[PDB]
Design a protein around this ligand. Structure first.
Ligand SMILES: [Zn+2]
Lengths: 50, 209, 107
Protein backbone atom coordinates (compact mmCIF):
# COMPACT_ATOMS: atom_id res chain seq x y z
CA UNK A 1 0.00 0.00 0.00
CA UNK A 2 1.47 3.40 -0.89
CA UNK A 3 0.76 7.12 -1.19
CA UNK A 4 2.47 9.37 -3.73
CA UNK A 5 2.04 12.66 -5.49
CA UNK A 6 0.27 10.94 -8.33
CA UNK A 7 -2.54 10.53 -5.79
CA UNK A 8 -2.85 14.23 -4.94
CA UNK A 9 -2.49 15.82 -8.39
CA UNK A 10 -5.63 17.52 -9.78
CA UNK A 11 -7.33 16.04 -12.82
CA UNK A 12 -8.46 17.50 -16.11
CA UNK A 13 -12.10 18.37 -15.58
CA UNK A 14 -11.41 19.73 -12.12
CA UNK A 15 -9.44 22.59 -13.67
CA UNK A 16 -12.38 23.61 -15.82
CA UNK A 17 -15.00 23.34 -13.08
CA UNK A 18 -12.79 25.21 -10.64
CA UNK A 19 -12.21 27.95 -13.20
CA UNK A 20 -15.91 28.35 -13.93
CA UNK A 21 -16.98 28.20 -10.29
CA UNK A 22 -14.38 30.73 -9.18
CA UNK A 23 -15.51 33.09 -11.92
CA UNK A 24 -19.13 32.66 -10.88
CA UNK A 25 -18.52 33.38 -7.21
CA UNK A 26 -16.51 36.52 -7.93
CA UNK A 27 -19.14 38.03 -10.22
CA UNK A 28 -21.78 37.39 -7.57
CA UNK A 29 -19.40 38.84 -5.01
CA UNK A 30 -19.04 41.92 -7.17
CA UNK A 31 -22.81 42.19 -7.63
CA UNK A 32 -23.46 42.19 -3.89
CA UNK A 33 -20.78 44.77 -3.04
CA UNK A 34 -22.13 47.00 -5.79
CA UNK A 35 -25.66 46.65 -4.43
CA UNK A 36 -24.44 47.67 -0.98
CA UNK A 37 -22.19 50.60 -1.79
CA UNK A 38 -24.94 52.11 -3.95
CA UNK A 39 -27.42 51.58 -1.10
CA UNK A 40 -29.64 49.46 -3.36
CA UNK A 41 -28.95 46.31 -1.32
CA UNK A 42 -32.01 44.95 0.51
CA UNK A 43 -31.23 44.61 4.23
CA UNK A 44 -31.74 41.09 5.53
CA UNK A 45 -34.51 41.11 8.18
CA UNK A 46 -32.21 39.75 10.88
CA UNK A 47 -29.18 42.05 10.83
CA UNK A 48 -27.74 45.20 9.30
CA UNK A 49 -26.63 45.53 5.70
CA UNK A 50 -22.98 44.99 6.59
CA UNK B 1 -58.68 49.62 31.43
CA UNK B 2 -61.34 48.40 33.88
CA UNK B 3 -61.25 45.20 31.80
CA UNK B 4 -57.72 44.09 32.60
CA UNK B 5 -58.25 44.70 36.32
CA UNK B 6 -61.48 42.70 36.24
CA UNK B 7 -59.61 39.93 34.42
CA UNK B 8 -57.00 40.05 37.18
CA UNK B 9 -59.72 39.84 39.82
CA UNK B 10 -61.35 36.84 38.13
CA UNK B 11 -57.99 35.09 37.75
CA UNK B 12 -56.94 35.66 41.35
CA UNK B 13 -60.34 34.46 42.54
CA UNK B 14 -60.01 31.32 40.40
CA UNK B 15 -56.50 30.51 41.61
CA UNK B 16 -57.18 31.18 45.27
CA UNK B 17 -60.36 29.10 45.13
CA UNK B 18 -58.41 26.27 43.50
CA UNK B 19 -55.96 26.43 46.40
CA UNK B 20 -58.82 26.29 48.91
CA UNK B 21 -60.16 23.18 47.20
CA UNK B 22 -56.70 21.62 47.13
CA UNK B 23 -56.24 22.19 50.85
CA UNK B 24 -59.55 20.33 51.23
CA UNK B 25 -61.88 23.03 52.53
CA UNK B 26 -65.56 23.28 51.59
CA UNK B 27 -66.19 24.52 48.06
CA UNK B 28 -68.86 24.28 45.35
CA UNK B 29 -67.88 22.86 41.97
CA UNK B 30 -70.04 25.29 40.01
CA UNK B 31 -67.79 28.11 41.19
CA UNK B 32 -64.61 26.26 40.16
CA UNK B 33 -65.55 26.65 36.49
CA UNK B 34 -66.82 30.22 36.94
CA UNK B 35 -66.22 32.20 33.74
CA UNK B 36 -64.93 35.76 33.44
CA UNK B 37 -68.27 36.81 31.98
CA UNK B 38 -69.83 35.03 34.95
CA UNK B 39 -67.62 37.12 37.25
CA UNK B 40 -68.85 40.25 35.47
CA UNK B 41 -72.41 39.01 35.98
CA UNK B 42 -71.89 38.41 39.71
CA UNK B 43 -69.68 41.48 40.21
CA UNK B 44 -69.92 44.84 38.48
CA UNK B 45 -67.27 46.67 36.49
CA UNK B 46 -64.05 47.92 38.10
CA UNK B 47 -65.25 51.51 38.69
CA UNK B 48 -68.36 50.15 40.44
CA UNK B 49 -66.45 47.53 42.47
CA UNK B 50 -64.73 48.03 45.82
CA UNK B 51 -61.48 46.10 46.17
CA UNK B 52 -61.20 45.93 50.00
CA UNK B 53 -64.64 44.26 50.36
CA UNK B 54 -66.06 42.86 47.15
CA UNK B 55 -63.82 39.79 46.94
CA UNK B 56 -63.59 38.95 50.67
CA UNK B 57 -64.45 35.27 51.10
CA UNK B 58 -64.98 33.05 54.14
CA UNK B 59 -67.34 30.33 52.84
CA UNK B 60 -64.67 27.63 52.91
CA UNK B 61 -64.65 25.45 56.03
CA UNK B 62 -62.69 22.31 56.83
CA UNK B 63 -65.65 20.14 55.85
CA UNK B 64 -63.13 17.44 54.98
CA UNK B 65 -62.87 16.63 58.69
CA UNK B 66 -64.80 19.37 60.52
CA UNK B 67 -67.43 21.51 58.76
CA UNK B 68 -67.48 23.79 61.81
CA UNK B 69 -63.92 25.02 61.11
CA UNK B 70 -64.44 28.22 59.13
CA UNK B 71 -61.63 29.99 57.25
CA UNK B 72 -61.33 33.62 56.14
CA UNK B 73 -59.86 35.23 53.01
CA UNK B 74 -59.06 38.97 52.88
CA UNK B 75 -58.02 41.38 50.13
CA UNK B 76 -56.68 44.78 51.25
CA UNK B 77 -56.59 47.70 48.78
CA UNK B 78 -53.66 49.95 49.68
CA UNK B 79 -50.34 49.22 47.90
CA UNK B 80 -48.64 48.62 51.27
CA UNK B 81 -50.79 47.21 54.06
CA UNK B 82 -50.60 49.19 57.31
CA UNK B 83 -50.71 48.34 61.00
CA UNK B 84 -54.17 49.82 61.54
CA UNK B 85 -55.62 47.73 58.73
CA UNK B 86 -54.30 44.48 60.18
CA UNK B 87 -55.56 45.58 63.60
CA UNK B 88 -59.01 45.98 62.04
CA UNK B 89 -58.60 42.57 60.42
CA UNK B 90 -57.55 40.97 63.71
CA UNK B 91 -60.44 42.48 65.67
CA UNK B 92 -62.85 41.30 62.96
CA UNK B 93 -61.18 37.88 63.18
CA UNK B 94 -61.62 37.78 66.95
CA UNK B 95 -65.26 38.72 66.47
CA UNK B 96 -65.59 35.83 64.02
CA UNK B 97 -63.72 33.48 66.41
CA UNK B 98 -61.44 31.77 63.88
CA UNK B 99 -57.79 30.67 64.08
CA UNK B 100 -56.12 31.81 60.83
CA UNK B 101 -56.72 33.93 57.74
CA UNK B 102 -55.16 34.70 54.34
CA UNK B 103 -54.15 38.18 53.14
CA UNK B 104 -53.54 39.34 49.55
CA UNK B 105 -51.32 42.41 49.14
CA UNK B 106 -51.19 44.59 46.03
CA UNK B 107 -47.59 45.84 46.19
CA UNK B 108 -46.27 45.42 49.72
CA UNK B 109 -46.82 45.92 53.44
CA UNK B 110 -45.15 47.98 56.14
CA UNK B 111 -42.03 46.73 58.00
CA UNK B 112 -43.51 47.14 61.48
CA UNK B 113 -46.37 44.92 60.33
CA UNK B 114 -43.73 42.65 58.79
CA UNK B 115 -42.42 42.16 62.33
CA UNK B 116 -45.91 41.87 63.80
CA UNK B 117 -46.74 39.18 61.20
CA UNK B 118 -44.80 36.61 63.27
CA UNK B 119 -46.02 37.23 66.83
CA UNK B 120 -49.74 38.16 66.86
CA UNK B 121 -50.57 35.14 69.02
CA UNK B 122 -49.55 31.48 69.37
CA UNK B 123 -53.18 30.54 68.64
CA UNK B 124 -53.44 32.81 65.57
CA UNK B 125 -51.35 32.81 62.38
CA UNK B 126 -51.59 34.71 59.10
CA UNK B 127 -50.40 33.96 55.56
CA UNK B 128 -49.59 36.63 52.96
CA UNK B 129 -49.44 36.13 49.18
CA UNK B 130 -48.47 38.55 46.42
CA UNK B 131 -50.99 39.46 43.75
CA UNK B 132 -48.19 38.85 41.27
CA UNK B 133 -47.60 35.26 42.40
CA UNK B 134 -51.26 34.31 42.71
CA UNK B 135 -51.88 35.35 39.11
CA UNK B 136 -50.69 31.84 38.18
CA UNK B 137 -51.22 28.60 40.10
CA UNK B 138 -47.84 26.86 40.20
CA UNK B 139 -49.46 23.47 40.64
CA UNK B 140 -50.30 23.54 36.93
CA UNK B 141 -46.85 24.66 35.77
CA UNK B 142 -45.02 22.18 33.61
CA UNK B 143 -41.86 22.12 35.80
CA UNK B 144 -43.58 21.28 39.12
CA UNK B 145 -44.12 17.58 39.84
CA UNK B 146 -47.17 16.66 41.88
CA UNK B 147 -46.77 17.07 45.63
CA UNK B 148 -48.97 15.19 48.11
CA UNK B 149 -49.26 15.46 51.89
CA UNK B 150 -49.84 12.31 53.95
CA UNK B 151 -51.00 11.40 57.44
CA UNK B 152 -48.70 10.52 60.33
CA UNK B 153 -49.38 6.80 59.89
CA UNK B 154 -48.07 6.91 56.34
CA UNK B 155 -44.80 8.45 57.50
CA UNK B 156 -44.66 5.89 60.28
CA UNK B 157 -44.89 3.06 57.76
CA UNK B 158 -42.37 4.72 55.46
CA UNK B 159 -39.74 5.22 58.14
CA UNK B 160 -40.36 1.63 59.21
CA UNK B 161 -39.76 0.35 55.67
CA UNK B 162 -36.30 1.81 55.10
CA UNK B 163 -35.28 1.57 58.79
CA UNK B 164 -34.63 5.32 58.91
CA UNK B 165 -34.57 8.06 61.51
CA UNK B 166 -36.81 10.95 60.55
CA UNK B 167 -33.97 13.46 60.36
CA UNK B 168 -32.28 11.44 57.59
CA UNK B 169 -34.77 12.26 54.80
CA UNK B 170 -34.09 14.89 52.12
CA UNK B 171 -35.30 18.35 53.10
CA UNK B 172 -37.63 20.95 51.60
CA UNK B 173 -37.57 24.58 52.69
CA UNK B 174 -40.58 26.03 54.49
CA UNK B 175 -40.57 29.17 52.34
CA UNK B 176 -40.70 27.14 49.15
CA UNK B 177 -43.46 28.38 46.81
CA UNK B 178 -45.12 24.96 46.84
CA UNK B 179 -44.77 24.68 50.61
CA UNK B 180 -46.47 28.06 50.91
CA UNK B 181 -49.16 26.93 48.48
CA UNK B 182 -49.98 23.94 50.66
CA UNK B 183 -49.66 25.95 53.88
CA UNK B 184 -47.84 23.05 55.54
CA UNK B 185 -46.02 23.56 58.85
CA UNK B 186 -42.55 22.43 59.89
CA UNK B 187 -42.11 18.73 60.60
CA UNK B 188 -44.56 17.40 58.01
CA UNK B 189 -43.61 15.13 55.10
CA UNK B 190 -44.36 15.38 51.37
CA UNK B 191 -44.51 12.74 48.64
CA UNK B 192 -43.40 13.56 45.10
CA UNK B 193 -44.18 11.65 41.90
CA UNK B 194 -41.65 12.73 39.31
CA UNK B 195 -42.89 12.18 35.73
CA UNK B 196 -40.33 9.86 34.22
CA UNK B 197 -38.83 10.21 30.78
CA UNK B 198 -41.13 7.23 30.13
CA UNK B 199 -44.42 5.83 31.45
CA UNK B 200 -42.68 4.94 34.72
CA UNK B 201 -42.66 7.09 37.83
CA UNK B 202 -40.19 7.63 40.65
CA UNK B 203 -41.41 8.29 44.20
CA UNK B 204 -39.37 10.40 46.61
CA UNK B 205 -40.10 11.97 49.98
CA UNK B 206 -39.07 15.36 51.37
CA UNK B 207 -39.34 16.83 54.87
CA UNK B 208 -40.37 20.42 55.58
CA UNK B 209 -37.89 22.44 57.63
CA UNK C 1 -26.52 75.77 23.60
CA UNK C 2 -24.79 77.99 26.16
CA UNK C 3 -24.91 81.71 26.99
CA UNK C 4 -21.93 83.84 27.97
CA UNK C 5 -21.33 87.40 29.15
CA UNK C 6 -20.05 89.86 26.55
CA UNK C 7 -18.32 91.67 29.40
CA UNK C 8 -16.52 88.71 30.97
CA UNK C 9 -16.95 85.67 28.71
CA UNK C 10 -18.43 83.52 31.50
CA UNK C 11 -21.52 81.35 31.44
CA UNK C 12 -24.87 83.03 32.08
CA UNK C 13 -27.69 81.81 34.31
CA UNK C 14 -31.40 82.74 34.25
CA UNK C 15 -33.10 84.38 37.23
CA UNK C 16 -36.07 86.55 38.17
CA UNK C 17 -35.89 89.53 40.51
CA UNK C 18 -38.15 92.02 38.74
CA UNK C 19 -41.16 92.07 36.42
CA UNK C 20 -39.24 90.08 33.79
CA UNK C 21 -36.84 87.15 33.86
CA UNK C 22 -33.27 87.81 32.75
CA UNK C 23 -30.00 86.20 31.84
CA UNK C 24 -27.34 87.48 34.22
CA UNK C 25 -23.72 87.04 35.24
CA UNK C 26 -22.47 86.07 38.69
CA UNK C 27 -19.22 88.02 38.24
CA UNK C 28 -20.17 91.34 36.61
CA UNK C 29 -23.39 93.37 36.68
CA UNK C 30 -24.19 92.51 33.07
CA UNK C 31 -27.83 91.47 32.76
CA UNK C 32 -30.02 90.78 29.72
CA UNK C 33 -33.77 90.57 30.22
CA UNK C 34 -35.64 87.95 28.19
CA UNK C 35 -38.70 89.61 26.63
CA UNK C 36 -39.29 86.76 24.15
CA UNK C 37 -38.89 83.03 23.59
CA UNK C 38 -36.27 80.50 22.45
CA UNK C 39 -36.62 76.95 21.16
CA UNK C 40 -33.65 74.69 22.03
CA UNK C 41 -33.34 72.35 25.03
CA UNK C 42 -30.58 70.22 26.64
CA UNK C 43 -32.27 66.93 25.57
CA UNK C 44 -33.08 65.58 29.08
CA UNK C 45 -32.83 61.89 30.12
CA UNK C 46 -35.34 59.29 31.42
CA UNK C 47 -35.06 55.52 30.98
CA UNK C 48 -36.94 52.94 28.87
CA UNK C 49 -40.73 52.64 29.10
CA UNK C 50 -40.99 48.86 28.64
CA UNK C 51 -43.77 47.20 30.65
CA UNK C 52 -46.07 50.10 31.55
CA UNK C 53 -48.68 48.27 29.45
CA UNK C 54 -47.24 44.78 29.65
CA UNK C 55 -49.05 41.56 28.90
CA UNK C 56 -52.63 41.85 27.66
CA UNK C 57 -52.88 45.61 28.07
CA UNK C 58 -55.63 48.01 27.00
CA UNK C 59 -57.48 47.17 23.79
CA UNK C 60 -57.78 50.71 22.39
CA UNK C 61 -54.76 50.29 20.06
CA UNK C 62 -56.41 47.72 17.77
CA UNK C 63 -55.71 48.08 14.04
CA UNK C 64 -57.00 46.56 10.80
CA UNK C 65 -54.07 45.89 8.43
CA UNK C 66 -51.29 43.41 9.22
CA UNK C 67 -48.53 41.46 7.45
CA UNK C 68 -48.08 37.66 7.24
CA UNK C 69 -45.33 35.03 7.44
CA UNK C 70 -43.73 33.32 4.42
CA UNK C 71 -43.87 29.82 5.99
CA UNK C 72 -47.05 28.87 7.87
CA UNK C 73 -49.41 31.89 7.98
CA UNK C 74 -51.36 30.93 11.11
CA UNK C 75 -53.71 33.63 12.36
CA UNK C 76 -51.94 35.29 15.35
CA UNK C 77 -49.06 37.80 15.12
CA UNK C 78 -50.59 41.24 14.37
CA UNK C 79 -48.15 44.09 13.71
CA UNK C 80 -46.32 46.37 16.11
CA UNK C 81 -43.39 48.74 15.71
CA UNK C 82 -41.14 50.71 18.07
CA UNK C 83 -38.32 53.26 18.33
CA UNK C 84 -34.59 53.10 18.96
CA UNK C 85 -33.17 55.81 21.24
CA UNK C 86 -34.14 59.48 21.09
CA UNK C 87 -35.92 62.34 19.37
CA UNK C 88 -33.52 62.62 16.44
CA UNK C 89 -32.83 58.85 16.39
CA UNK C 90 -34.51 56.29 14.12
CA UNK C 91 -37.31 53.73 14.43
CA UNK C 92 -37.13 49.95 13.99
CA UNK C 93 -39.75 47.44 12.82
CA UNK C 94 -39.72 43.77 13.90
CA UNK C 95 -41.94 40.74 13.30
CA UNK C 96 -42.25 38.12 16.07
CA UNK C 97 -44.18 34.81 16.09
CA UNK C 98 -45.04 32.72 19.17
CA UNK C 99 -47.10 29.51 19.17
CA UNK C 100 -44.78 27.05 20.94
CA UNK C 101 -41.52 25.06 20.96
CA UNK C 102 -39.54 27.40 18.70
CA UNK C 103 -37.77 30.78 18.75
CA UNK C 104 -39.03 32.73 15.76
CA UNK C 105 -38.88 36.50 15.75
CA UNK C 106 -38.01 38.37 12.53
CA UNK C 107 -36.74 41.96 12.24
ZN1 LIG D 1 -18.80 86.40 34.72
Amino acid sequence: FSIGIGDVTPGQGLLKAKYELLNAGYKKCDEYIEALNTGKLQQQPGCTAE
Amino acid sequence: DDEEETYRLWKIRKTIMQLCHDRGYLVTQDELDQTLEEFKAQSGDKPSEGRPRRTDLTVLVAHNDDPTDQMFVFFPEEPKVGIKTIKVYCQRMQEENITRALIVVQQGMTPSAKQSLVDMAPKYILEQFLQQELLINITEHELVPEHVVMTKEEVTELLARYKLRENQLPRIQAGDPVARYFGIKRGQVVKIIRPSETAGRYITYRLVQ
Amino acid sequence: MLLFCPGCGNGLIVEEGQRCHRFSCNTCPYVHNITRKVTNRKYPKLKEVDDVLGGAAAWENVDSTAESCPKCEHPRAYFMQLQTRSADEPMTTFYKCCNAQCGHRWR
